[PDB]
Amino acid sequence: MKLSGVELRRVQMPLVAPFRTSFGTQSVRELLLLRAVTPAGEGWGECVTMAGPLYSSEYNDGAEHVLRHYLIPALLAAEDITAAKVTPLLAKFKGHRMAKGALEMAVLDAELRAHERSFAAELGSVRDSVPCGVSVGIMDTIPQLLDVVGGYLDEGYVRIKLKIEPGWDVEPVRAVRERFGDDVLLQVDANTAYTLGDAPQLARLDPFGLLLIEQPLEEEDVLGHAELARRIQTPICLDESIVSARAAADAIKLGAVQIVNIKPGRVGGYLEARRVHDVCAAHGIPVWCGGMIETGLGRAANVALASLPNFTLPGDTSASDRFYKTDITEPFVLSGGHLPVPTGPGLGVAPIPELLDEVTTAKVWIG
Amino acid sequence: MKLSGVELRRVQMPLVAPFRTSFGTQSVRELLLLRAVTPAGEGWGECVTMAGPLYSSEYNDGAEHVLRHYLIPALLAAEDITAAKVTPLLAKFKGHRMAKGALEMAVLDAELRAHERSFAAELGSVRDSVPCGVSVGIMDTIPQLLDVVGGYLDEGYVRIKLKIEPGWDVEPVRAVRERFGDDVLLQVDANTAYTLGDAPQLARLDPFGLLLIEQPLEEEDVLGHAELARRIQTPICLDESIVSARAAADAIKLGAVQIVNIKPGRVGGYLEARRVHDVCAAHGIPVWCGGMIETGLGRAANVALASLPNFTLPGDTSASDRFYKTDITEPFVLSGGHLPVPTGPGLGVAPIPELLDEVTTAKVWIG
Amino acid sequence: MKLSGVELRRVQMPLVAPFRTSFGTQSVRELLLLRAVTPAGEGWGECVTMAGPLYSSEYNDGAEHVLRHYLIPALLAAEDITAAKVTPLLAKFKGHRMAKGALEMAVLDAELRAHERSFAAELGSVRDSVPCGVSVGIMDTIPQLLDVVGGYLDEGYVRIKLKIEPGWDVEPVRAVRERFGDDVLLQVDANTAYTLGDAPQLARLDPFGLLLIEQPLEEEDVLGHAELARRIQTPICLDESIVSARAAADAIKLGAVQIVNIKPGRVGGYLEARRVHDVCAAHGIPVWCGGMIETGLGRAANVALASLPNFTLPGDTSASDRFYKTDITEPFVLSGGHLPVPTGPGLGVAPIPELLDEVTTAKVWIGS
Amino acid sequence: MKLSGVELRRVQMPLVAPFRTSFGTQSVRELLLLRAVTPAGEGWGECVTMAGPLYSSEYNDGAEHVLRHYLIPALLAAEDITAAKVTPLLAKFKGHRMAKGALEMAVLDAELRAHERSFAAELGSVRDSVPCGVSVGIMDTIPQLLDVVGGYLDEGYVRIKLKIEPGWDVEPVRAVRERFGDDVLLQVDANTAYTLGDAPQLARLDPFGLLLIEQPLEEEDVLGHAELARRIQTPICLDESIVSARAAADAIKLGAVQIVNIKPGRVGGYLEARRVHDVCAAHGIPVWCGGMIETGLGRAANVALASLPNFTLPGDTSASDRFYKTDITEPFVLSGGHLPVPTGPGLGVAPIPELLDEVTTAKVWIG
């Protein structure tokens, strides 16, 4: 293809209900969407950054600026463009994985739509639906939590993931296990809230049989997780630390992880995400798909990715309505705790202009 | 996709000159070809087995049999078929990687052709041509060899690989280094010729400065290799032992390999091959594409594969004329020592029937 | 004590000569400076980012935005501020080490001035002057390289570092060793230009007796460096990878590094920089001070830093004029191949108003 | 600054109640104080030695002697003295850390006061008050023990530390736990009283959930600690062994310690103490401030030190009265289980002459 230009768009989508992690509470979702334009057709990409750099150093304004000033321009300069070529084309620019992932996604959507191929096909999907878990936030009360959990449980959600923080760990856990039982698929997510010195507190979770504890320590603390792994029973799962397939291999070699959460944007794109998957598989490390409160746009692509062979645990691929009353694309609906893998070319989804325009705050053309 | 049937051909190409390995001399290459027939169109597969079981336990007739009786039927019995799904579908059958790979290859070719996608595209190529080296055999003499080598050098080949075996090691090497120089990309191939106890002998080449020594010991002797890596200077490269991406991870993790030779059929297909590439890449292990003296069909796929990012060493992607007087597809022509990546859909190449029929020794339709 | 605000200023300074590294060629320096205002007085910080994210993910516009919209506001919202408290106060924001380091730098300078203490004193200096090396970029020709190097050597620089990259490694090294001898302190810097697959080429540098080879591989590839180290004789030195004292400890443990290049901005500030020095020291790992073509402001803080006990190798603390014809503060002049550690309060230096104003491209006041 | 001279003063302070450890019983505290004099003003240093070489090889008379004849003389001989320079200036003298630490302290107090800077600012304090534990000696009776423990807990101490010794370990612990509950922060200290062979005995404490076991083995036995760590669940904490930042690094590397007690004099100074803290922090090793029964002078410096970021466990920084009915400075008074970090320049405290005079035994001036 020849890249004609990219339309960058800001979107704000209110949450159905505040979402609280160890890094804060969220009531609305500010996101960056990209529309790639080829003489041929368009492709959509979604950025996973939030407003401020709270999960990672990347943020909405930042991603926009880099895409705008550096990444888009570099691609426009390239004679012939391929989703695979994006990487090499943007290599001179250090970091900015989410931004890069979003652009590559857009490019890929367009490229595939053109070959009349689905994300699923390109990625190597082996199934037509995927089991979905849900990410439950930090509550104000336990009872509050319990209703919530129970709720999702009825919706048909397959696995329950609890955001934890110091002062919101063992109890909430103890509570769900007690009330909900021992056969619920249960795991926690610290979003880097702890330190090695908190091992004992976390060891206190040993007894509840969680599938895993996600990113207990800071992003950069790989060896620390390996140490931690040696002090707790709960399996370590890394998210933030997994910025690439190499990052994955290193962590695995170091004993710092047993399960990996794959978030495509975090790693710089769905192509790299695929690499992550294969690398983990090759080491006997199960993976699962992480979520960044995406629109049906990222949701679609993620569902496709989650259908890969090593995605052996339910991922954070909930239905549209878990967050949004109204999605910009046709909604994702939970059918028996699963989601259907899209069938059209590219993402298999596209925004409903009407809806999109309704949530668009800014727009800019880059050619 | 829906598999209509497979047609199996036996073909017999007459080698320009006999090619002597650590397992036996070669005058005519007997190959097994596959024509997968679908709704839409067809695809071609190429088996890398040989007449009999000397590089591996797989051979032309066993391959035919397994395919005919186990593999093909399994796919035929499927509803939707994708090259990715091939693996899962055949998983109950233990081993037979070359056979599976060939089958997968035929399917993929047909799938890509249907999406108007090239192999290269699908595989994530980023380069348009690839540097080619040549595999030099066991000579009966020195000058003989020194001549050939010198010969290949002339035509544009960028790297020289030298078949070795007890009694054909250090000397031959000594001679070429001597005669042709030191700034020549040179490396050897023992085809399991040695043993740990042979270490001291293989230590003998330290001096020369070879890019690597390939498969010095048995397929199964990984530890031996790592040990061996310990007792020599020349970087270990594995071929035979690398039967999969997991195999690679393991060998790497054990320090048994520094560079990996990728042979798509040996690992079960281009898809697994791509993963081997990705695995190696995540561990900083350079890869190069291994050759099985194929037609323009395996050659085209190899070339595409060889154009991936981590193929940082020239492959056994020698021109059509290196082995074959008359290929059954447009031939491959060196040019600046490179081979151009095929731009057409699927393999981007197809057999010229007369040519093909001239060589066919048998066929079978399987429906 | 309590932050009054911070002035963000953009500055553009022409290099006396274009500087080329594996990531490109620079003919001008675009910097971000900070003037922090406190009741006790003002302090100056210098950010080490460049125009685009080529050495790292951080860049001028990015740093300015984050400072402006997150970091400054956060310090302004505090009741009390100390350079030390800067880190915890800004910890909720991931990364942006360069930006944070510049901000902590400005606070620390104001703070130190208020106590009439110099950065050197604060950091634990033990020496009054420091041996200086020079960082030489990639040339068009060798002869060209040979001259430049010859000139520096003449100026009295104690060590030569050569920027390298694929296609500009062994030769240039050979050439210089050839021409200037084996007694000269010589080292190279790839700025991540290589990969593990390149070991053999790198192993070719073995014979030159280099002090070290700096950041051959990518920033995130620590294990590869440990592996590389096993493959080559030249000592590995890391720059880009060392983003903190913990990063240094980890690389050290993993045997990925033998010598550490310390860059205050890269690690998030002078305070963290001291910690890295200390951690290295505790592990028997020598350190040296890196440079980012700073104005006299960062140069001064660097000189102070580089006077610390474990900085046992000449650093990238060249005289002002190696890059700038006209520096914005009193210039740093080499004497006997050394630079004197500054003696006044804070940085011990300050910009000359007219000089600064002349290179200033933009300025903004960030107050509550 | 230039050092004019130093006044070395012997002081003896009676304890509110005798203090028994594995190396003995303390009824009266014999200290050494330093009053540094510089052209500008003075600074006070406190040495942690005791009368005899029972905790370490250093003792009051030895300290005074080395200071008089070697240390002080070396500082007087320098033209420019800075706290930082004390080290390099005293480097030729092997050992004598506590004595060097005392001198550094006095110099640093003068130096900081000159700049009107507190020890806390200099050290890098992040907090204004610190949570306090208390060290409880060996009792004759368990009941005597519970009484004492309940008293301290009643005063608001945040943590209980018990001196243990063969014949006084499990029982004492079992009892406090029984009596006071599982929620109390409880740890123990052997002051090197056991041997590797005593492992089964120590393992007997595992059930009790102690925070740590402090210095179970002899000072020089690092490897032994590493081994012991293997046989017991209680986390190992080192005191005696940690004579410096490098020692901490080494011990950490050898797996001999999980938590480090930092004692400024032990390591040769508050400056070195800061380095230890930093080294530990970089390795994820929590630290806490150790106590030596100091006067308000050392108490003051310790409280400032303990307010550093990686002091994430309560230290042996009890209220003045825990030992002394009448301290020589303004007293430290426990508040909400905490002590406030001093705000003045240097120590932020000074001796009350009148008081100081009463407890002074000897005094000399070194000029």
Ligand SMILES: O=C(O)CCC(=O)N[C@@H](C(=O)O)c1ccccc1
């Ligand atoms: O289900 C989802 O899409 C969100 C699940 C989730 O926990 N996402 C968290 C995360 O830290 O992983 C998140 C959301 C948005 C932005 C950053 C982080």
Ligand SMILES: O=C(O)CCC(=O)N[C@@H](C(=O)O)c1ccccc1
């Ligand atoms: O096919 C080529 O271009 C080179 C041939 C080659 O060296 N491969 C050899 C091998 O043993 O690796 C081979 C050829 C044919 C069959 C088996 C093996």
Ligand SMILES: O=C(O)CCC(=O)N[C@@H](C(=O)O)c1ccccc1
């Ligand atoms: O801060 C401002 O008010 C203007 C500067 C600004 O917007 N910086 C932007 C930009 O869009 O130009 C930016 C740069 C880098 C990162 C994020 C945003």
Ligand SMILES: O=C(O)CCC(=O)N[C@@H](C(=O)O)c1ccccc1
């Ligand atoms: O400042 C100096 O004296 C030499 C500067 C130097 O070599 N720094 C390079 C580097 O990669 O280390 C640099 C300068 C500016 C910005 C980034 C990097």
Ligand SMILES: O=C(O)CCC(=O)N[C@@H](C(=O)O)c1ccccc1
């Ligand atoms: O032993 C004696 O009583 C006479 C010598 C003596 O006091 N030794 C002193 C000293 O003060 O000179 C001393 C030396 C070494 C250690 C402690 C004290």
Ligand SMILES: O=C(O)CCC(=O)N[C@@H](C(=O)O)c1ccccc1
């Ligand atoms: O709280 C305090 O100040 C004393 C705590 C303590 O146990 N100190 C002991 C020790 O073994 O650490 C001690 C006191 C005085 C002298 C030596 C050792």
